[PDB]
């Protein structure tokens, strides 16, 4: 009869990557087949005071703590690839380093579990590390893996910072992306999806005073977000201290839904993108942060992305509409920390 | 201090995805009662299974796509758009034995599936422009059916892989005036530094560009279009090779061995394809033991796909092995 996305498969564009997502809103349903940690871990290669398996001790820390790591899959000082422009086998050199950042010292609460003022710091230590990153490499990656589902096996809660001498994949097509959007339209992209969002609210997940999380109209993974600022902001580093304060709130509510969910420590990987370090004129970009959970219909089962997916193209069942409505019946304080 | 490819992080173009990958060097009965795809027995929806031999193809229960799904508006709109998607999908069961995968069957039970794939794929080509055949393989791929069996799809559209991977061939064709992979496949036979298994017609090797640790990427030595376009001695011997490749990757670590895996052919557009080259890719998770596997989260999603092991690696370990089922040893 007449379309309706509510009802009928469709494809939804994601102008950040120009990929599409095959939406499939009404498939059959199968039938009904029915219905704590320490503080401080002894072990625990992260916890303050402890010895790494390196040898090196961390410090008797009280907030964030950050060393480079152990096992760096980058270094600053690699020789060369030699350029090559064969068309079927061609590699190019690569420079970098990583960090890992301890989000407190309490072996046992992750992000949504942390006070306003705690993660207050988190985002100081992001900026500062951002800052002294970007003056020697042009792309900054800000990320977090949380979760045995995500192949984490030690629970204490930490992310990691990457520097890249070159602009990994993701980052140049969305700067490209980016770019295209803004030379045409002669605004960025995200700061007018965010005024698009901001009048519909049906996918809308999170609202603050300066921050807006939403599930986005071409997510891909079930209940994935994408958090971003009101106003345009480049870099985490431009933010003014009252959207870095509202921004520790917005972390706060958006994890603490999460966890509300499925009433458990609910995994992801999230990362933050922003204007690279290059030199050149970068007002085309917005920065924002992606959160990319696996789990779907429990906590314990998850969508996993294979076969059709990683062949042709992702394929979700629940749309981006129903996923924000199941994340806004929930509350916004973690149940840890409410008395239910 | 010379750059070493051996010892030094680099990053490595992928020419069918135009993507970059970053690599750092240094770094069971034969029936169940209760299966829905065992011969004989009842589906979900009631719908009984017939005593088949060989090869048995269904319409999935639980589509995602129909083929007569109404249109979607056209819109050019640049940050909200949806598009129409129209198709299909089956399963396919690979033969009656509930417990006997790819590698343990007979290669005339293969050849079977081969036959099976190419009606399947010309059969759908009829009304859609793209064919995916394809198997998800093993519990850490989510299958809860050990069942052997894949799955066909048929698209209205070019789903994004098929549309890059398009675009990309056809650029190198128009500059070399040769197919990409049939380049590719000359230049690795004469190295055999990533080769895995080779037939008389075949060769599976684990690409420059492997992403996932023991990725393989077969392909036939013969310029081919689609998988309709064997000749009966290349499909016979198509059979040959998967039973090698997929004998080598179980017996790597000994046990069944997860994959997704698929193949990717011209699509039935009407238009001139020569500069495709028929090929199926290997997408394995096991990285360090049958336990321990790779994770394609984090930098990976963020960023770009990261690999420790590097593909002149992970292809020596392959080659070390047998290449002869460890049950039929
Ligand atoms: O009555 C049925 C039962 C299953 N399936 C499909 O057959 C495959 C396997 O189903 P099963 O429960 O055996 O395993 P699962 O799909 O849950 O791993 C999947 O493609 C299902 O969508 C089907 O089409 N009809
Ligand atoms: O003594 C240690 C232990 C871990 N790590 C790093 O911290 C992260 C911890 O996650 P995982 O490997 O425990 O899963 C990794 O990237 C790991 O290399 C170190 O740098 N030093
Ligand atoms: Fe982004
Ligand atoms: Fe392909
Ligand atoms: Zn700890
Ligand atoms: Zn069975």
Redesign the interface.
Known sequence: ???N?VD??????N?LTG??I?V?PH?????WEGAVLPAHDPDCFLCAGNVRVTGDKNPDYTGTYVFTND?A???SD?????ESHD?????????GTSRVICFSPDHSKTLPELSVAALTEIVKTWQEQTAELGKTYP?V?V???KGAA??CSNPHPHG?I?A?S?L????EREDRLQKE?FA??KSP?LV??VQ?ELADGSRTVVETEHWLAVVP?WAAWPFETLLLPKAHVLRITDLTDAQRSDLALALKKLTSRYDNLFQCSFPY?M?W?GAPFNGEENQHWQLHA?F?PPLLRSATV?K?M???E??????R?LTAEQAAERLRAVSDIHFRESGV
């Open positions: 009869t007449q379309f996305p009928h498969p469709h494809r939804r564009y102008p990929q599409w095959l499939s498939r059959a349903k199968r039938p096992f899959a980058l270094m690699t020789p060369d690839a030699p068309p079927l086998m061609r590699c190019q050199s690569a420079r792309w990656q990320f977090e893996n995500m192949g990691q990457w890249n070159f990994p994949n993701e980052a959007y045409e339209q992209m007018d999806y698009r109209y990987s990362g993108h992606h990319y998850r996993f294979v076969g059709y990683m062949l042709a193209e992702t394929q069942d």
